[PDB]
Symmetry: C4
Subunit: 206 residues, 4 copies
């Protein structure tokens, strides 16, 4: 874990996320905890043109590396790291299913046993607030207190985990759940859910 190997790795997450359909028109960003702060994708420079040299390091105070412009979503990446000390990588994105669920302002309940993968019996939704402002940072932080992903209302998805591969994987699983929810939800309401006890066994068992 040098800076340049995490930089390559961050960029690999971008092309992997694009591949899967989790990122459209360069909407999302990706970051890893580093030193006293983090390493994040910069704004502007289109994904397919990126290198290790462009990755920006924002320190713990919000002091970025002169000469580079961090993504605009960096404020709620830092919120994610102080909210969950165990998080080492954040993934942000506007995957279509997540975003439509977040536009209904809904948590996904326990419609499948993989719900437990984000730490509990649901994936919450954080209330809307103008991008890059203090209050959005605070909404994200309340949401990730006991959950490892969250929807952002009228906006998108933020997932966090112990490394990029597991963060990238969780973004992806939350996107399958969103879709299963919306599809079933067009047929019936409420959709059937597993109980809190059965979920209790799944969490223990994980």
């Amino acid at each position: 874990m040098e800076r340049n190997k995490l930089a390559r790795q961050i960029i690999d997450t971008c092309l992997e996320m694009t591949r899967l359909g989790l990122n459209q028109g360069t909407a999302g960003n990706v970051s890893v905890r580093y030193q006293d702060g983090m390493l994040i994708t910069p704004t502007g420079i289109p994904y397919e043109k990126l290198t290790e040299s462009h990755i920006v390091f924002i320190d713990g105070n919000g002091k970025h590396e002169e000469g580079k412009l961090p993504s605009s979503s960096w404020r709620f990446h830092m919120a994610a790291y102080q909210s969950r000390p165990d998080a080492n990588a954040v993934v942000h994105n506007h995957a279509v299913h997540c975003t439509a669920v977040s536009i209904l302002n809904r948590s996904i309940p326990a419609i499948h046993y993989m719900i437990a993968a984000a730490g509990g019996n649901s994936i919450p939704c954080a209330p809307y607030a103008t991008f890059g402002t203090r209050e959005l940072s605070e909404h994200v932080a309340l949401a990730l207190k006991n959950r490892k992903a969250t929807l952002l209302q009228h906006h998108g998805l933020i997932a966090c985990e112990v490394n990029l591969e597991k963060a990238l994987w969780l973004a992806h699983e939350v996107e399958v759940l969103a879709q299963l929810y919306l599809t079933t939800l067009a047929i019936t309401d409420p959709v059937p859910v597993l109980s809190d006890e059965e979920i209790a066994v799944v969490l223990e068992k994980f």
Copy 2:
């Protein structure tokens, strides 16, 4: 910016648009402002067989280059350029989500903050009128007065911007919005929207 570099670039937009799923069976066309008129894709010649030599230049009077047949959608490309002096590239297409929204004859409202990217709090729909006729040109022109994209009822999508990469990007973002709209709209009506004030902050902030 020579003619041949814009020609290559126009064709790159075609294969990029096809890649993303924004163009099916060679439905759309693409054009850039050039000299006194524009440069457009020709009719017939299938997309994957195209070269710089085929791109046609239609002058400002509607006088095309002898020996080539402009696309059939060229009339509302020219309508786009006289309607919005700031537009330098037009993208047309029949992306499935846009077209289904345009078949319900509906504007997409402010269901997500990226709505502001087309200049306001909605993506309008221009009334139907037989392809390639004076009145369709006029409907497109009213629609793009204060908007940078528009749906075309029972037809498709037209997006415009300062260059091909940003025009291509906007086609794509309007297609994500369409989909989010129709998906959420199968669950509930009306779908929740951001207010005109919150949109007002988003536009300022862009």
Copy 3:
């Protein structure tokens, strides 16, 4: 137009159809008019393993080339050729949208001006009848009398045209229409349609 160049071409239609999403698990077949009868894909041999040598010629009497087994759908390919003398290539498939429309037993009406591409103001549905039997052949034949594609109820899609590229293209456009229909139809019923007069202009104009 030798036999081997049409054979290559038939196989290219298969990999093109697969690419687009029009063929799943080797469901469809493809055929061109040849001599007194036609040339068709054989049964069994999986698509990605095919060569010109495998293509079968079924004569006009139903007499196939010893040593090969024509597809099982060959009976309604021959029905297509005697029904429409102008047809030179047939495409069959179970594209998901078509098939779901054909499972509701519905014609797609004039929800978009490309409806005219199959010869009229609708894409019909032929009643169900056990695969490969005389009566299914007859249902297909009534349906293609005044139309160039048709849905097959509880089954799939059959498209025909002057060559493979235009037949393949029409399969594809009927699949976009199916989807637009079903998507809009989950929101509202009946879905809006263009009138018979406006369609009348579109047909003339084509």
Copy 4:
């Protein structure tokens, strides 16, 4: 049929399943009957990094090869083999359509003649039970008594057949049926089905 050629083949099923969209984030597993027990994918090792050396052989008693960890789904693979003596390959997965149907707890009825491919006039759903426990094994076993695939409620799909290519193919066809079901089902309920007699002809005829 050596161990290493079935190992390669198992892994080829994985990349083929991923390709088609039947496997997301390494959710499914794949197994073939071998000797007195079977050969299965191991847990952990991500799909794109796999080799023949990693495939595990679990004997008929549940005694695995020291040094390797079988998948966690191995218990209902063995249930599949003792339930259906004719099965030589099992495919498991969480394909999105199947899973949403299995979340409504529904069998897919006879909405298309390919329903007969799994042995009867429906694809059943086995009741939910904590992964990897005796009772889930028993539910899977009742379900596959007279069927060659089954949904698993709030979970996924299990398909079985005479070889990997036909097992992989059946997973895929059950996924097309699921989708056709859910799509049509958003428009109307109940969806139209073919009768038990017409199905009776289809089974005979297969």
